[PDB]
Design a protein around this ligand. Structure first.
Ligand code: CL
Ligand code: CL
Ligand code: ZN
Ligand code: ZN
Ligand code: ZN
Ligand code: ZN
Lengths: 776, 776
């Protein structure tokens, strides 16, 4: 172990949790950014599995009778493992074909169906050139996955082809149904020829959103929806049942909440008779989880049915973990298998989490268990209630923008989850303080830093509302670390919807404290300009009186042809508080330098004609030399190399630059033999990044990453030698998701570390050896 | 400028905001109590316009191609302005005919349709004798509004005739539709002959609540409702669309919240093809604002549609202002015009407010902007969150009952908005503290005063729940002004639903502190009697221990034939704390006087046989004389003059009265030439008032106002001369809404002022010159 994770567990949208039918307590989890995790203790702890070509996983299936053979459906196609998920290989027939369901023929594990699909991730189906519209197809293997046949069930190239489920008749293994936006289809020869099943009301709601079939094969359950381009605005899915011997649908929503996106129904494999247990959650909607009971008679008539919430709002009966997400959005839900020694239970989620319910057949009760985070003995106070801090169970799937550390305190600023805070060095966390009174949540935190309020170390943060990275505005908050404990509180200083302190509403893509005067804080409001808090102690003095001290505007950026309009990273000068650098990503791009004059006025100018949306600049001092380091595209004549991002270095504050790292350097230090995905999607890979470069003392770090495909090439550490040259080494090591949004060199407990945040796998740190620092 | 407003902005139900099609950023706002406001900076600041005959405005329309010609639909009929709204004239054809929609024929601004209507104000359609039932009619002008024709489209005199919208075919200017409770009607000759369009289900929901028509004229959108007498209990309006070439409705509510009063749909004038953007809010219901997208093909089939919330609950993305009204009730919503240089945007409201959204066509995003209030640098704490105080943007539409002032602190007690508090002398305000824990809001505050708690000035208030003036109970609250800052808090002392301190549930129509002993507070519980807090400092001592000190009943009013049962205003004696006066408005009416005896008992008796629901009495001392002043109807033989309200004065505590002001006096001091409305509705005007009389030193003030028609005659100031006579002068000046609920003479910063609250336009103050006071 080299890279050390510091996360509270999970935190990203979970696609599925799949049980191994051959052995109780063995489960796999499909993440949308880090691939597949495995557990052999029913989710008490999770371990990463082998490397996939694409990490956006929609389906995992374990071969009945062979736990070593596992199939994984990803956005780029099907993978097969023959060593129990230790290693994976892309299946050539399905390359560039997103797969989201995998089903085995009952009694013949060599007969497999893998169906094109992508769950609700319509936003991502085009990342590799696919479209939602196309012929309706499935892939069928009859030799256990060595070869696959392409079967067409609909030939309309202009209609949505997403398949949501494939389900076999347990009582007649050659009968199989599929549920698709194309409709529900049936095959009586194992999936080689299909016929369409008419829906309950195809003129109005033709799209199927999942089917279920009773084990005796006699009853089909389905939900149906109107045709609309985006699930965001398609809210009412209705639930129906029909006998399969004569298609005649009846609506069976009596007892369900109205106007919900019910999907992926599923019959308990234990329902072998005329009473069927049907598990029903939904995409997006938060209502917990339903179990329905349908009592048919032997005439094929439904005597009665009833839906029961077996999971509901937070009420004290289950540990919600750190992710206070109530009611649960049960975006997947499965009964446990009847094989392998499994007990009867339910696997589900609150959306970003993993939950397992055990079942009491005496009183038909469910007991929900947190399978993503572990509470510690530390407590935080919020809503007048005490909540534990939580340490991860082995997974981490958060989009983390930035990180700051002071003594025992760590904060990572995340998308979706906002202010993620730790008071034990990053072992356990809580983000409860981001849920503010008045009904708004500080769910997007793009920058954090540590300032100085009259000698008291004070966290500063760009913290605003908005999910999925859709930050609403620039908004500056501060937390005085009086106790380095959960008792410390956040207060708002500037920005927000109310334009507090005269700070405009443009997002502060970075907030930076001056190392020379840590009371002074710089921030760049997107499309407005660069602003400054001269002394944060004075700003808090006004705040404590119920007043507000205005911020100072030091640069105006409102002209696209002449001004820098957006900044990604601000680098104050390490020793001169009247000089700052920033990387401009809007208007006139590149590294900009500003200098304050005696009358307090500033002059700004471009010092490197670079570009790139996530371009960074860093300035530090080491043994008498001030280094200026740019990670970006371009640079001008003699430096630009197409759209390749490069590391450029200057020792004279940006008047002269030297190219010290390129993609060719990266490939020589870390050959493409190290990348499982090079042969298949290397022709698409672009040498860019999400950020994550840093410099301190004699060390420099960077990471090549292409967010278009969630592909990370590697992490590279450079050592500045006594003569000026930089020698580079590969420090990727065991970091499996290596793209980086930010990196900082941080000394903790007398040892120098590299703290790095990732756009999908949270926070990691790594020991750095042989480092020299200036005494500071 | 003479009268100075002190308000946080808006605060009353907004009827519409209408853009000028000829010039970007010029807008008009229809208020229901002060007429029409105009802005030329897209709502950053608002200015009043000319005087209307009736101030309840339902519609405003700007003549295309002539920004100086403006039409205004009011409860009393149509007004026309030819000088850009600087002055108005009533249109004789529509006198006494409430108008709520005005539409111009495309390409011919001389062809105008004005439709009878009154939006949702069914409570007010009878104020001037009209009824909702009657023939369905529209007014049509073909010469730009010099003359109007009355067109009948339905002749049933017993069915509701409200028209909600009139919409032309942009592609065929002679085709026009209207949407009415009578149904949807169509004309193919510019509105001179109409035919009925059958609704989707006329046996069940025949009433139309607004229509929209695509610019190409091919698709009609509408919402339809069951026939019910009151919108309060009619909650489910369904949305439909039909091709206009063959009426065949289809329901299109998929994606909308169920059971909502969707109304006034509107197609973007930019939707010139087969994809239509439809804007949809509702009356009363709070869900934000929907934009729908309808994609038709050239066969006249709807391929798909989807509804998107472009405005939703308070989440941090927009400034809610001082009126924490979430989710928004978008009771009107309009796209900006395509002419005049307008950008694409949306004008709407949270109910009592004005909001504008700018639009980003790159990502189809909306950015909502507060266009009714302006945040300051002062903050208040509520819900554990910091909220700014807000100063008005130029409008004020609150029903304000009463006002109190102490040093920098001001409170106006309002209906709907409750405890409206200021800490900068009335510039900026916040009412957040009226939203109490446990889910009740102190939204009705009919009386406020300043008491003395052991030397600490302490606000006292009748503050209870209930909207629209429907106060639930009598309930006494107190705020110790320890800091004269938002840190001071309200505590409950007596009354309420729980009968605290033995105070009954009758509303305390007035609360009055004794000027001789400002620790002693009087209050009159409607239909129970008169009660007293002997020493409020002692009451708060019990309260701070978690206990309650009982109030003292000093007068029992439970006999309609012998007792005073309801009081409107209490006037404690200025120097003798054992004497109080009050104006009785229930049971035996008139000015009553009570005197406390040595054993603590009180004797009460009627001293002036006056009457009137809003009758007032004031007692003050000046240069050795105690003045008692009554503003009321009646008085007895030699004083009564029909139902005319008069000012009566007594210098011997009510044993002898002299008449010092009458309507004839008012008309001689302020001739009817000063009133735009005298010729049209002067025959209805009654010389009454809502209150607003006061006396202090050598000055007396009163205001004649008839709430039945929202007509204010004028404000009159009287000077008590050295010989006893009173000389009166007209001080209406620039006060456009001059009816008054309360007036107080208040010295602020060494200058004497008159603070006056109005039943619809908030709080105003005016410098008073040449005033003499007793040193107090
Ligand atoms: Cl049903
Ligand atoms: Cl529908
Ligand atoms: Zn997804
Ligand atoms: Zn940062
Ligand atoms: Zn109204
Ligand atoms: Zn009062």
């Amino acid at each position: 172990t080299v890279w050390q994770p510091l996360n509270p567990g999970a935190g990203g949208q979970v696609q599925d949790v799949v049980a191994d039918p051959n052995q109780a307590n063995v489960v796999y989890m499909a993440s949308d950014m880090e691939g597949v995790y495995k557990s052999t203790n029913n989710g008490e702890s999770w371990q990463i599995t082998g490397n996939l070509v694409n990490n956006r996983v929609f389906a995992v299936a374990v071969t009945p009778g062979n736990s070593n053979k596992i199939f994984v459906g990803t956005l780029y196609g099907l993978h097969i493992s023959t060593n129990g998920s230790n290693s994976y290989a892309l299946v050539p027939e399905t390359e560039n074909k997103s797969i989201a369901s995998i089903a085995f023929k009952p009694g013949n594990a060599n007969h497999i169906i893998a169906a094109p699909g992508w769950r609700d991730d319509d936003d991502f189906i085009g990342k590799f050139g696919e479209t939602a519209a196309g012929p309706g197809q499935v892939f069928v293997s009859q030799n256990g996955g060595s070869s696959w046949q392409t079967v067409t069930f609909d030939s309309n190239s202009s209609t949505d082809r997403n398949v949501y489920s494939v389900v076999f008749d347990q009582s007649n293994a050659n009968t199989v149904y599929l549920g698709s936006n194309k409709g529900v289809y049936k095959s009586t020869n194992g999936g080689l020829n299909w016929q369409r099943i008419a829906g309950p009301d195809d003129a109005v709601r033709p799209w199927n959103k999942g089917i279920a079939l009773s084990p005796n094969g006699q009853v089909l359950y389905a939900t149906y929806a109107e045709a609309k381009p985006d699930l965001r605005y398609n809210t009412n899915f209705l639930v129906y049942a029909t006998r399969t011997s004569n298609i005649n649908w009846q609506q069976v929503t009596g007892g369900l909440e109205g106007n919900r996106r019910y999907w992926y129904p599923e019959v308990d494999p234990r329902s072998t008779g005329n009473s069927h247990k049907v598990l029903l959650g939904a995409v997006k909607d938060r209502f917990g989880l339903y179990e329905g009971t349908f009592n048919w008679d032997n005439n094929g008539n439904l005597t009665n049915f009833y839906w029961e919430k077996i999971w509901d709002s937070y009420d004290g009966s289950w540990d919600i973990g750190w992710d206070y997400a109530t009611p649960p959005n049960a975006r997947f839900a499965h009964y446990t298998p009847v094989t392998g020694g499994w007990a009867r239970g339910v696997w589900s989620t609150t959306n970003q989490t993993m939950y397992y319910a055990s079942h009491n057949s005496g009183n038909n009760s469910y007991s929900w268990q947190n399978k993503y985070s572990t509470p510690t003995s530390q407590t935080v106070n919020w809503y007048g209630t005490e909540w534990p801090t939580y340490k991860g169970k082995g997974t981490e799937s958060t989009y983390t923008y930035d990180v700051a550390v002071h003594e025992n305190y760590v904060i990572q600023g995340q998308a979706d989850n906002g202010l993620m805070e730790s008071w034990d060095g990053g072992v356990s966390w809580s983000n409860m303080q981001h849920r503010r009174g008045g009904g708004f949540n500080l769910s997007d935190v793009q920058a954090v830093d540590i300032a100085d309020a009259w000698g008291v170390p004070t966290v500063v943060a760009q913290a605003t509302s908005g999910y999925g990275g859709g930050a609403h505005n620039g908004r500056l908050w501060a937390k005085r670390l009086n106790t380095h404990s959960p008792a410390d509180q956040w207060v708002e200083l500037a920005g927000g919807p109310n334009a507090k302190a005269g700070l405009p509403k443009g997002v502060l893509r970075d907030v930076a404290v001056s190392p020379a005067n840590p009371a002074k804080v710089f921030m760049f409001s997107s499309n407005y300009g660069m602003y400054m808090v001269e002394d944060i102690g004075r700003a808090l003095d006004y705040h404590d009186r119920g007043e507000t001290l205005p911020v100072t505007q030091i640069y105006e950026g409102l002209d696209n042809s002449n001004d820098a309009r957006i900044a990604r990273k601000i680098a104050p000068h390490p020793t001169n508080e009247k000089v700052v650098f920033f990387s401009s990503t809007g208007g006139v791009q590149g590294v900009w330098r500003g200098e304050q004059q005696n009358d307090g006025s500033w002059t700004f100018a471009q010092v490197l004609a670079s570009s790139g949306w996530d371009a960074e600049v860093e300035a530090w001092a080491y043994n008498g030399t001030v280094y200026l380091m740019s990670f970006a595209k371009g640079g001008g004549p003699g430096l630009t190399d197409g759209n390749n991002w490069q590391i450029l270095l200057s020792t004279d504050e940006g008047q002269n630059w030297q190219k010290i790292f390129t993609p060719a350097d990266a490939m020589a230090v870390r050959p493409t033999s190290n990348l499982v995905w090079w042969n298949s999607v290397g022709n698409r890979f672009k040498f860019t990044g999400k950020g994550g470069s840093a410099g301190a003392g004699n060390k420099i770090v960077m990471s090549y990453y292409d967010h278009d495909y969630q592909l990370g090439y590697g992490v590279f550490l450079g050592t500045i030698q006594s003569n000026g040259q930089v020698n580079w080494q590969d420090i990727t090591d065991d970091l499996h998701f290596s793209g980086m949004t930010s990196s900082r060199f941080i000394k903790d407990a007398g040892q120098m570390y590299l703290y790095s945040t990732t756009p999908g796998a949270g926070l990691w740190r790594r020991s750095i050896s042989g480092m020299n620092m200036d005494p500071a």
